[PDB]
């Protein structure tokens, strides 16, 4: 029932692989790029700061 037949010192800290062969990837948090259309931008009409 171990990960291997004969657990060594390094090997015995492992866990059993899942009986289902499929391991779904986890959903990790993503930090997107913070770009501001600041005031100097001509599309921002002079005094608008869009923190996109």
């Amino acid at each position: 029932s171990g990960p291997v037949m004969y657990p060594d010192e390094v090997t015995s800290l492992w866990t059993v692989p899942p009986w289902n062969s499929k391991v779904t990837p986890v959903e990790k948090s993503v930090r997107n790029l913070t770009l501001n259309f600041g005031p100097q931008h001509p599309a921002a009409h002079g005094v608008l700061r869009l923190v996109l």
Binding site: A43, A44, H45, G46, V47, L48, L50, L52
Partner: protein, 52 residues
């Protein structure tokens, strides 16, 4: 609104572009950056009346 004196007690200016820039968050979402630039123009919004 006036208290009967020579000066107005309080004058509030309803910006036409205030609600447009408020709904910019939903209108401009899931679009391109160039699509955001055109949308900002489509709402007409000089920020003197918005900022008051």
């Amino acid at each position: 609104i006036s208290d009967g004196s020579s000066r107005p007690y309080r004058c509030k200016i309803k910006a036409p572009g205030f609600a447009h820039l408020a709904a910019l968050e939903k209108i401009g979402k899931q679009h391109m950056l160039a699509d955001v630039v055109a949308i900002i123009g489509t709402l007409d919004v000089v920020f003197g009346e918005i900022d008051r």
